[PDB]
Short mmCIF file of C-alpha atoms and ligand atoms in Angstrom, two decimals:
data_model
loop_
_atom_site.label_atom_id
_atom_site.label_comp_id
_atom_site.label_asym_id
_atom_site.label_seq_id
_atom_site.Cartn_x
_atom_site.Cartn_y
_atom_site.Cartn_z
CA UNK A 1 220.06 -51.21 45.72
CA UNK A 2 216.42 -50.78 44.69
CA UNK A 3 214.29 -53.80 43.69
CA UNK A 4 211.23 -53.27 41.48
CA UNK A 5 208.14 -55.39 40.98
CA UNK A 6 205.97 -56.00 37.95
CA UNK A 7 203.41 -53.59 39.38
CA UNK A 8 206.16 -50.99 39.80
CA UNK A 9 207.29 -51.41 36.20
CA UNK A 10 203.67 -51.28 35.02
CA UNK A 11 203.13 -47.96 36.84
CA UNK A 12 206.53 -46.68 35.76
CA UNK A 13 206.04 -47.28 32.04
CA UNK A 14 202.53 -45.87 32.48
CA UNK A 15 204.11 -42.89 34.24
CA UNK A 16 206.59 -42.24 31.45
CA UNK A 17 209.71 -42.96 33.50
CA UNK A 18 212.84 -44.44 31.94
CA UNK A 19 214.88 -47.40 33.16
CA UNK A 20 218.63 -46.81 33.29
CA UNK A 21 220.20 -50.13 32.25
CA UNK A 22 223.73 -49.26 33.36
CA UNK A 23 222.48 -47.58 36.53
CA UNK A 24 220.25 -50.45 37.74
CA UNK A 25 217.29 -48.15 38.52
CA UNK A 26 214.37 -46.25 36.97
CA UNK A 27 214.41 -42.45 36.67
CA UNK A 28 211.56 -39.95 36.67
CA UNK A 29 211.80 -36.16 36.72
CA UNK A 30 215.58 -36.40 36.94
CA UNK A 31 215.43 -38.44 40.15
CA UNK A 32 216.00 -42.12 40.92
CA UNK A 33 212.59 -43.70 41.50
CA UNK A 34 211.72 -45.09 44.92
CA UNK A 35 209.62 -48.29 44.43
CA UNK A 36 206.04 -48.51 45.67
CA UNK A 37 206.57 -50.85 48.62
CA UNK A 38 209.72 -49.04 49.74
CA UNK A 39 207.83 -45.74 49.54
CA UNK A 40 204.96 -47.22 51.52
CA UNK A 41 207.12 -48.77 54.22
CA UNK A 42 208.89 -45.44 54.61
CA UNK A 43 205.71 -43.33 54.65
CA UNK A 44 203.90 -45.70 57.00
CA UNK A 45 206.91 -45.52 59.32
CA UNK A 46 206.84 -41.73 59.25
CA UNK A 47 203.11 -41.60 59.98
CA UNK A 48 203.46 -44.00 62.90
CA UNK A 49 205.95 -41.67 64.58
CA UNK A 50 204.18 -38.36 63.93
CA UNK A 51 200.63 -39.26 62.96
CA UNK A 52 200.63 -36.08 60.90
CA UNK A 53 197.68 -35.59 58.55
CA UNK A 54 197.76 -36.09 54.78
CA UNK A 55 197.93 -32.38 53.97
CA UNK A 56 200.70 -31.99 56.53
CA UNK A 57 203.06 -34.84 55.59
CA UNK A 58 202.59 -34.06 51.90
CA UNK A 59 203.70 -30.44 52.35
CA UNK A 60 206.51 -31.53 54.65
CA UNK A 61 207.67 -34.03 52.04
CA UNK A 62 207.62 -31.65 49.08
CA UNK A 63 209.56 -29.26 51.30
CA UNK A 64 212.03 -32.01 52.19
CA UNK A 65 213.42 -31.89 48.64
CA UNK A 66 213.86 -35.65 48.39
CA UNK A 67 216.63 -37.10 46.18
CA UNK A 68 214.12 -39.79 45.22
CA UNK A 69 210.86 -39.74 43.27
CA UNK A 70 208.49 -41.60 45.59
CA UNK A 71 206.31 -43.83 43.42
CA UNK A 72 202.59 -43.57 44.10
CA UNK A 73 203.39 -41.24 46.96
CA UNK A 74 200.11 -39.34 47.41
CA UNK A 75 197.93 -42.40 46.77
CA UNK A 76 199.85 -44.41 49.36
CA UNK A 77 199.99 -41.45 51.75
CA UNK A 78 196.22 -41.12 51.65
CA UNK A 79 195.68 -44.84 52.28
CA UNK A 80 197.93 -44.76 55.35
CA UNK A 81 196.28 -41.72 56.95
CA UNK A 82 192.72 -42.71 56.00
CA UNK A 83 193.23 -46.13 57.60
CA UNK A 84 195.19 -45.06 60.66
CA UNK A 85 192.95 -45.94 63.61
CA UNK A 86 194.89 -43.70 66.00
CA UNK A 87 194.22 -40.75 63.71
CA UNK A 88 190.63 -41.97 63.48
CA UNK A 89 190.17 -41.87 67.24
CA UNK A 90 191.85 -38.50 67.82
CA UNK A 91 189.42 -37.06 65.27
CA UNK A 92 186.26 -38.96 66.19
CA UNK A 93 185.93 -36.47 69.03
CA UNK A 94 182.50 -34.90 68.88
CA UNK A 95 180.41 -35.02 72.07
CA UNK B 1 199.45 -33.48 97.77
CA UNK B 2 198.54 -30.36 95.79
CA UNK B 3 200.26 -27.01 96.50
CA UNK B 4 198.51 -23.77 95.52
CA UNK B 5 199.88 -20.31 94.86
CA UNK B 6 198.45 -16.88 95.51
CA UNK B 7 197.58 -16.62 91.83
CA UNK B 8 195.79 -19.97 92.06
CA UNK B 9 193.77 -18.84 95.06
CA UNK B 10 193.00 -15.54 93.35
CA UNK B 11 191.64 -17.38 90.29
CA UNK B 12 189.88 -19.95 92.46
CA UNK B 13 187.97 -17.45 94.59
CA UNK B 14 187.25 -15.55 91.36
CA UNK B 15 186.07 -18.85 89.87
CA UNK B 16 183.71 -19.60 92.75
CA UNK B 17 185.51 -22.71 93.96
CA UNK B 18 185.58 -23.71 97.62
CA UNK B 19 188.58 -24.70 99.72
CA UNK B 20 188.13 -27.86 101.79
CA UNK B 21 189.97 -27.19 105.05
CA UNK B 22 189.93 -30.79 106.27
CA UNK B 23 190.71 -32.12 102.79
CA UNK B 24 193.74 -29.89 102.09
CA UNK B 25 192.55 -28.95 98.58
CA UNK B 26 190.16 -26.71 96.62
CA UNK B 27 187.06 -28.12 94.92
CA UNK B 28 185.21 -26.95 91.83
CA UNK B 29 182.34 -28.68 90.05
CA UNK B 30 182.57 -31.58 92.49
CA UNK B 31 186.18 -32.26 91.58
CA UNK B 32 189.49 -31.61 93.34
CA UNK B 33 191.15 -28.68 91.59
CA UNK B 34 194.43 -29.19 89.77
CA UNK B 35 196.61 -26.07 90.31
CA UNK B 36 197.65 -23.87 87.37
CA UNK B 37 201.34 -24.82 87.20
CA UNK B 38 200.61 -28.52 87.68
CA UNK B 39 197.99 -28.30 84.92
CA UNK B 40 200.46 -26.51 82.66
CA UNK B 41 203.33 -28.91 83.28
CA UNK B 42 201.00 -31.80 82.54
CA UNK B 43 199.47 -30.25 79.40
CA UNK B 44 202.84 -29.11 78.07
CA UNK B 45 204.11 -32.66 78.60
CA UNK B 46 201.18 -34.09 76.68
CA UNK B 47 201.63 -31.66 73.79
CA UNK B 48 205.33 -32.45 73.54
CA UNK B 49 204.56 -36.13 73.01
CA UNK B 50 201.66 -35.79 70.59
CA UNK B 51 201.81 -32.22 69.30
CA UNK B 52 198.04 -32.46 68.89
CA UNK B 53 196.23 -29.21 68.09
CA UNK B 54 194.19 -27.16 70.55
CA UNK B 55 190.83 -28.38 69.28
CA UNK B 56 192.11 -31.95 69.40
CA UNK B 57 193.63 -32.12 72.89
CA UNK B 58 190.67 -30.21 74.32
CA UNK B 59 188.16 -32.74 72.97
CA UNK B 60 190.41 -35.62 74.01
CA UNK B 61 190.63 -34.16 77.51
CA UNK B 62 186.90 -33.58 77.99
CA UNK B 63 186.46 -37.14 76.77
CA UNK B 64 189.08 -38.37 79.24
CA UNK B 65 186.68 -37.68 82.11
CA UNK B 66 189.39 -36.38 84.42
CA UNK B 67 189.00 -36.78 88.21
CA UNK B 68 190.51 -33.29 88.50
CA UNK B 69 189.30 -29.85 87.48
CA UNK B 70 192.26 -28.47 85.54
CA UNK B 71 192.63 -24.81 86.49
CA UNK B 72 192.95 -22.42 83.56
CA UNK B 73 192.99 -25.42 81.26
CA UNK B 74 191.90 -23.92 77.94
CA UNK B 75 193.87 -20.70 78.44
CA UNK B 76 197.03 -22.67 79.19
CA UNK B 77 196.30 -25.18 76.43
CA UNK B 78 196.06 -22.38 73.88
CA UNK B 79 199.33 -20.79 75.03
CA UNK B 80 201.20 -24.10 74.68
CA UNK B 81 199.93 -24.87 71.18
CA UNK B 82 200.16 -21.28 69.91
CA UNK B 83 203.79 -21.09 71.03
CA UNK B 84 204.89 -24.57 69.99
CA UNK B 85 207.52 -24.01 67.31
CA UNK B 86 207.29 -27.60 66.06
CA UNK B 87 203.58 -27.11 65.46
CA UNK B 88 204.45 -23.76 63.88
CA UNK B 89 206.79 -25.37 61.37
CA UNK B 90 204.55 -28.31 60.44
CA UNK B 91 201.87 -25.74 59.62
CA UNK B 92 203.98 -23.03 57.99
CA UNK B 93 203.91 -25.21 54.88
CA UNK B 94 201.40 -23.03 53.03
CA UNK B 95 201.23 -22.16 49.33
CA UNK C 1 221.06 -22.13 49.25
CA UNK C 2 223.12 -22.76 52.40
CA UNK C 3 224.41 -19.85 54.52
CA UNK C 4 227.43 -20.38 56.78
CA UNK C 5 228.60 -18.51 59.85
CA UNK C 6 232.05 -17.73 61.16
CA UNK C 7 231.63 -20.52 63.70
CA UNK C 8 230.69 -22.90 60.88
CA UNK C 9 233.76 -21.94 58.87
CA UNK C 10 235.93 -22.25 61.98
CA UNK C 11 234.65 -25.80 62.59
CA UNK C 12 234.83 -26.63 58.89
CA UNK C 13 238.47 -25.62 58.41
CA UNK C 14 239.18 -27.39 61.72
CA UNK C 15 237.32 -30.40 60.33
CA UNK C 16 239.33 -30.49 57.12
CA UNK C 17 236.42 -29.74 54.79
CA UNK C 18 236.88 -27.80 51.56
CA UNK C 19 234.87 -24.83 50.30
CA UNK C 20 233.74 -25.09 46.69
CA UNK C 21 233.97 -21.54 45.31
CA UNK C 22 231.99 -22.21 42.14
CA UNK C 23 229.48 -24.38 44.00
CA UNK C 24 228.69 -21.89 46.80
CA UNK C 25 229.00 -24.52 49.56
CA UNK C 26 231.48 -26.48 51.69
CA UNK C 27 232.10 -30.20 51.10
CA UNK C 28 233.15 -32.93 53.52
CA UNK C 29 233.38 -36.66 52.85
CA UNK C 30 232.07 -36.11 49.33
CA UNK C 31 228.87 -34.50 50.59
CA UNK C 32 227.63 -30.90 50.71
CA UNK C 33 227.91 -29.72 54.31
CA UNK C 34 224.76 -28.84 56.25
CA UNK C 35 225.53 -25.80 58.51
CA UNK C 36 225.35 -26.07 62.29
CA UNK C 37 222.17 -24.07 62.87
CA UNK C 38 220.37 -25.71 59.95
CA UNK C 39 221.40 -29.12 61.30
CA UNK C 40 220.20 -28.16 64.77
CA UNK C 41 216.86 -26.76 63.63
CA UNK C 42 216.29 -29.93 61.63
CA UNK C 43 217.35 -32.31 64.43
CA UNK C 44 215.40 -30.42 67.08
CA UNK C 45 212.35 -30.61 64.82
CA UNK C 46 212.78 -34.36 64.41
CA UNK C 47 213.16 -34.91 68.15
CA UNK C 48 210.06 -32.87 68.91
CA UNK C 49 207.96 -35.15 66.71
CA UNK C 50 209.38 -38.50 67.82
CA UNK C 51 211.23 -37.82 71.05
CA UNK C 52 213.50 -40.71 70.10
CA UNK C 53 216.62 -41.17 72.21
CA UNK C 54 220.15 -40.21 71.17
CA UNK C 55 221.21 -43.76 70.33
CA UNK C 56 218.02 -44.21 68.33
CA UNK C 57 217.98 -41.06 66.18
CA UNK C 58 221.71 -41.43 65.52
CA UNK C 59 221.30 -44.96 64.15
CA UNK C 60 218.20 -43.91 62.22
CA UNK C 61 220.13 -41.01 60.71
CA UNK C 62 223.19 -43.01 59.66
CA UNK C 63 220.73 -45.46 58.12
CA UNK C 64 218.93 -42.62 56.34
CA UNK C 65 221.93 -42.19 54.04
CA UNK C 66 221.70 -38.40 54.00
CA UNK C 67 222.89 -36.45 50.93
CA UNK C 68 224.27 -33.89 53.40
CA UNK C 69 227.07 -34.01 55.96
CA UNK C 70 225.36 -32.67 59.09
CA UNK C 71 227.85 -30.40 60.85
CA UNK C 72 228.28 -31.08 64.55
CA UNK C 73 225.53 -33.66 64.29
CA UNK C 74 226.22 -35.88 67.31
CA UNK C 75 227.17 -32.98 69.58
CA UNK C 76 223.96 -31.13 68.71
CA UNK C 77 221.91 -34.34 68.86
CA UNK C 78 223.12 -35.00 72.39
CA UNK C 79 222.33 -31.45 73.53
CA UNK C 80 218.77 -31.70 72.21
CA UNK C 81 217.98 -35.05 73.86
CA UNK C 82 219.82 -34.28 77.11
CA UNK C 83 217.84 -31.05 77.48
CA UNK C 84 214.45 -32.30 76.32
CA UNK C 85 212.19 -31.99 79.37
CA UNK C 86 209.57 -34.32 77.90
CA UNK C 87 212.21 -37.02 77.55
CA UNK C 88 213.35 -36.11 81.06
CA UNK C 89 209.89 -36.71 82.52
CA UNK C 90 209.17 -39.96 80.66
CA UNK C 91 212.42 -41.29 82.11
CA UNK C 92 212.28 -39.82 85.61
CA UNK C 93 209.88 -42.66 86.39
CA UNK C 94 211.15 -44.51 89.43
CA UNK C 95 208.69 -44.96 92.31
CA UNK D 1 178.88 -47.88 80.98
CA UNK D 2 181.32 -50.81 80.92
CA UNK D 3 180.46 -54.04 79.07
CA UNK D 4 182.19 -57.28 80.08
CA UNK D 5 182.74 -60.50 78.16
CA UNK D 6 182.85 -64.10 79.29
CA UNK D 7 186.62 -63.99 79.08
CA UNK D 8 186.61 -60.87 81.26
CA UNK D 9 184.42 -62.54 83.87
CA UNK D 10 186.58 -65.66 83.74
CA UNK D 11 189.72 -63.60 84.42
CA UNK D 12 187.91 -61.48 87.01
CA UNK D 13 186.65 -64.39 89.11
CA UNK D 14 190.11 -65.93 88.68
CA UNK D 15 191.57 -62.60 89.81
CA UNK D 16 189.43 -62.42 92.93
CA UNK D 17 187.48 -59.33 91.92
CA UNK D 18 183.87 -58.78 92.98
CA UNK D 19 180.92 -57.79 90.81
CA UNK D 20 178.79 -54.96 92.19
CA UNK D 21 175.21 -55.85 91.25
CA UNK D 22 173.73 -52.44 92.05
CA UNK D 23 176.71 -50.63 90.52
CA UNK D 24 176.72 -52.48 87.17
CA UNK D 25 180.49 -53.09 87.23
CA UNK D 26 183.25 -55.28 88.70
CA UNK D 27 185.62 -53.96 91.37
CA UNK D 28 189.21 -54.91 92.15
CA UNK D 29 191.56 -53.25 94.61
CA UNK D 30 188.91 -50.66 95.41
CA UNK D 31 188.68 -49.54 91.80
CA UNK D 32 186.12 -50.09 89.04
CA UNK D 33 187.58 -52.63 86.63
CA UNK D 34 188.34 -51.60 83.06
CA UNK D 35 187.49 -54.55 80.74
CA UNK D 36 190.19 -56.27 78.68
CA UNK D 37 189.23 -54.98 75.23
CA UNK D 38 188.64 -51.45 76.51
CA UNK D 39 192.04 -51.57 78.23
CA UNK D 40 193.65 -52.83 75.04
CA UNK D 41 192.02 -50.28 72.76
CA UNK D 42 193.13 -47.54 75.14
CA UNK D 43 196.70 -48.83 75.54
CA UNK D 44 197.12 -49.48 71.83
CA UNK D 45 195.93 -45.93 71.19
CA UNK D 46 198.47 -44.55 73.64
CA UNK D 47 201.31 -46.55 72.13
CA UNK D 48 200.42 -45.41 68.62
CA UNK D 49 200.81 -41.77 69.66
CA UNK D 50 203.98 -42.08 71.73
CA UNK D 51 205.50 -45.43 70.80
CA UNK D 52 206.94 -45.50 74.31
CA UNK D 53 208.52 -48.77 75.42
CA UNK D 54 206.94 -51.29 77.79
CA UNK D 55 209.00 -50.23 80.80
CA UNK D 56 208.19 -46.60 80.05
CA UNK D 57 204.41 -46.72 79.57
CA UNK D 58 204.06 -49.06 82.55
CA UNK D 59 205.84 -46.62 84.88
CA UNK D 60 203.94 -43.70 83.37
CA UNK D 61 200.67 -45.54 83.95
CA UNK D 62 201.32 -46.52 87.56
CA UNK D 63 202.29 -42.89 88.08
CA UNK D 64 199.08 -41.74 86.41
CA UNK D 65 197.08 -42.98 89.40
CA UNK D 66 194.22 -44.30 87.29
CA UNK D 67 190.68 -44.40 88.74
CA UNK D 68 190.29 -47.75 86.96
CA UNK D 69 191.93 -51.14 87.41
CA UNK D 70 193.06 -52.00 83.89
CA UNK D 71 192.38 -55.70 83.35
CA UNK D 72 195.31 -57.67 81.95
CA UNK D 73 197.21 -54.42 81.65
CA UNK D 74 200.84 -55.60 81.60
CA UNK D 75 200.09 -58.66 79.46
CA UNK D 76 198.29 -56.52 76.89
CA UNK D 77 200.91 -53.77 77.14
CA UNK D 78 203.66 -56.24 76.33
CA UNK D 79 201.78 -57.66 73.34
CA UNK D 80 201.28 -54.18 71.86
CA UNK D 81 204.91 -53.10 72.20
CA UNK D 82 206.38 -56.48 71.20
CA UNK D 83 204.30 -56.47 68.02
CA UNK D 84 204.65 -52.80 67.11
CA UNK D 85 206.52 -52.79 63.80
CA UNK D 86 207.44 -49.10 64.12
CA UNK D 87 209.12 -49.85 67.44
CA UNK D 88 210.69 -52.90 65.77
CA UNK D 89 212.27 -50.79 63.04
CA UNK D 90 213.53 -47.97 65.28
CA UNK D 91 215.31 -50.65 67.31
CA UNK D 92 216.51 -52.94 64.52
CA UNK D 93 219.30 -50.42 64.00
CA UNK D 94 221.98 -52.58 65.62
CA UNK D 95 225.63 -52.99 64.66
ZN1 ZN E 101 197.84 -41.59 62.54
ZN1 ZN E 102 203.41 -28.92 68.99
ZN1 ZN E 103 212.22 -35.71 73.88
ZN1 ZN E 104 205.64 -48.51 68.78
#
């Protein structure tokens, strides 16, 4: 089961998502919403294993046709890539 | 010990490298020469684990300050990347 | 939409799955069935990016709670790992 | 050029390595010594891209026939792997 935080709810109401009382979870765009932290943990984990760029994971994700609406996906995705030091090194290569 | 093929020798003489009789191996640019197949096997192996692009591995390599002159490096490097289907998929995500 | 082959249907009927006429796809264990080739292409693609072992991807997959029943998953998963030369090299390391 | 710290020198003298005045660097086992932090940064970077286990990187390294003696290699290598959360997750899949 999904567990949401105040921040999550704040972003969700601000996003225009609905909370399904009987269902235990929020919905947006006809999908169950994946919380921010869950989304981050997942995305971080994916980047660690592939170290794919922002543009690349994003396209791969949208193509993955996820059952879940990943809250703050792109924002979190950027943070992860932009702060990945491994990615930073493999791209700091000018002579 | 390094083992060279006819093709290797053909490219080496064409490259202007010298063969060190007493040393058992060819030299180019003051480095022992890494044969073509050895170079390929190595590079392929590296690409499989990182799936880094051509431009990226190349820069990483030149920065690695290898003890060996990798025969037909760039040519082989291109082939590997250009024919990597995993790389092909992660980049076929265009709209 | 999913496209199935004779082989797929042969394994599916042999598996005890049902084909949903109106739905266009086979179902097994309450999930839409992912064809063999689709499953393979996907799994191969995952292994290429992580090169995780059999035991590891399997557990990761079962934990992923997939919406789809991946046809011939374990059999295909084994083949991929057992024939991955990169995995073969990183593990051929005895002195 | 290599830059060494007090800690490095402390471990180096304790290791029995010599410092080559004219050469600017310490030597151990006939190799130029790679400082601790440099070794760590390098090893961390390698683990990020492959997430190979301790036993695996170690064997791969020894097989790499490095020109440099990597200071505190195994100790640092362990720390990196043992504290890698990605590795922790991919292996926390136990039942
Ligand atoms: Zn990265
Ligand atoms: Zn690739
Ligand atoms: Zn593999
Ligand atoms: Zn790791």
